[PDB]
Amino acid sequence: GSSGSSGAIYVDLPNRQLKVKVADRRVISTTDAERQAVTPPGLQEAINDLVKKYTLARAFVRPSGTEDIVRVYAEANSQESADRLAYEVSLLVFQLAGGIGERPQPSGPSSG
C-alpha cells in the first residue's frame, strides 16, 4: 500500500470586488487637483475610519488602468463586513467620484 498528500493553501479570507463605470472625469468637485497628501484627501481617511470601525477590515480602489472602469475591493474577517464594506465603498465612490453605471446591489441575508 501507499498514500500521498496535497500541498496547497487551505484558507482564503472573504473578499468582495466591484466596478463603478464612472460616467467620466472632471466636473465633479471632489475629483480634481492632485497635491497635498495622497488624493483624494479624506477618502483614505473616511474609509480608513470604516476600516478601523470594523473588525480586521480592508478596503481599496483602483482607478484607470488598462481599462476605463474603476476597480473596487473590500475584505474583512467576516463575510458580512467584507460585503457591507464592499457595497459601501462602491457606493462611497459612486458619490465621491460621482460614479454611476452598474450600481452595487445588496447582498441580502438569505440562507437555506
UniProtKB/Swiss-Prot annotation:
Q: Which residues bind substrate?
A: 62-66, 71
Outline what the protein does.
Catalyzes the conversion of GlcNAc-6-P into GlcNAc-1-P during the synthesis of uridine diphosphate/UDP-GlcNAc, a sugar nucleotide critical to multiple glycosylation pathways including protein N- and O-glycosylation.
Family membership noted in the UniProt record? Belongs to the phosphohexose mutase family.
What's the name of the protein? Phosphoacetylglucosamine mutase
Q: What is the lineage of its organism?
A: Eukaryota, Metazoa, Chordata, Craniata, Vertebrata
Q: Which gene encodes it?
A: Pgm3
